[PDB]
Amino acid sequence: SMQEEDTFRELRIFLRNVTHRLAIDKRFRVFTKPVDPDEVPDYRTVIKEPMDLSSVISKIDLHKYLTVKDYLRDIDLICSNALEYNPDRDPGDRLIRHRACALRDTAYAIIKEELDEDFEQLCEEIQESR
Ligand SMILES: O=C(C1CCC1)N1C[C@@H]2C[C@H]3C[C@@H](O)[C@@H](O)[C@]2(C1)O3
């Protein structure tokens, strides 16, 4: 229905605004672009599904997310990719891991404060009907 297409349009507006707020935070610069294949040729042998905030915006605009739960699966993949590639005790790996945990926690805290639970449940029930 047109009412259902208006629901998904409001979801995309909400997701673009959360993603912009994460992308402008200086802590999260390292997550705003893909890990570059030239500079790190090893990366794509270890990490089988790369993800970053530029790819997330492109996915919003391609209508890949019908719920906030499917958006948070990609924010969780950004964070778990960084924990698995950079697991060592040295300061450069510990700094990346602390930033990855902060990007995940910050996304979940904005959603807990600003997403209406009945709006999410509506998106879930339209998705489950299709
Ligand atoms: O995992 C990441 C991203 C950082 C947030 C996630 N990288 C892997 C490389 C290791 C480290 C040092 C450079 O080699 C640079 O390319 C990366 C980027 O930083």
Residue indicated by tokens 């794509």: 44
DSSP 129: T
- For ligand 1, which residues put their CB under 6 angstroms from it? 30-31, 35, 39-40, 43, 82, 85-86, 96
- For a ligand 1 pocket test, name from 38, 85, 90, 98 the mutation site with the most ligand atoms within 8 angstroms of its C-beta: 85
CA nearest ligand 1 atom 4, residue: 30
Tokens, residue 123: 């998106």
Tokens of 67: 């719920």
- CATH number of the structural domain spanning residue 129: 1.20.920.10
Nearest ligand 1 atom to the CA of 31 is: 5
User: Which amino acid is located at 35 in the chain?
Assistant: V
Distance CA 112, CA 85 (A): 29
CB atoms within 10 A of CB 53: 19
Tell me the residue range of the domain where 24 lies: 1-130
Of the candidates 41, 40, 23, the one whose C-alpha atom is nearest the C-alpha of residue 32 is: 23
Cα–Cα distances in angstroms (integers) from residue 70 to residues 26, 30, 107, in the given order: 25, 22, 13
The answer to whether the beta carbons of residues 31 and 52 sit under 8 Å apart is: yes
What is the number of structural domains in the chain? 1
Element (H, E) at 46: helix 43-46
Q: Which residues contact 81 (CB under 8 A, 6 or more apart)?
A: 47, 49, 50, 51
Cα distance between residue 56 and residue 73, in whole Å: 11
Resolution of the structure in the document, Å: 1.5
Q: 108: part of which helix (H) or strand (E)?
A: helix 91-114
CA angle 81, 27, 113 (to 5 degrees): 85
Q: Which structural technique was applied?
A: X-ray
| Atom number of ligand 1 nearest to Cα 47 | 1
d(CA 20, CA 54): 10
Q: Taking phi first (over 0 means left), then psi (-120 to 50 degrees means alpha), and beta for anything else, what does residue 21 get? A: alpha
Secondary structure class of 36 (helix, strand, coil): coil
- Rounded Cα distance between 53 and 22, Å, is 8
Query: 23 is written with which tokens?
Result: 């992308």
The residue assigned the tokens 């209406």 is: 116
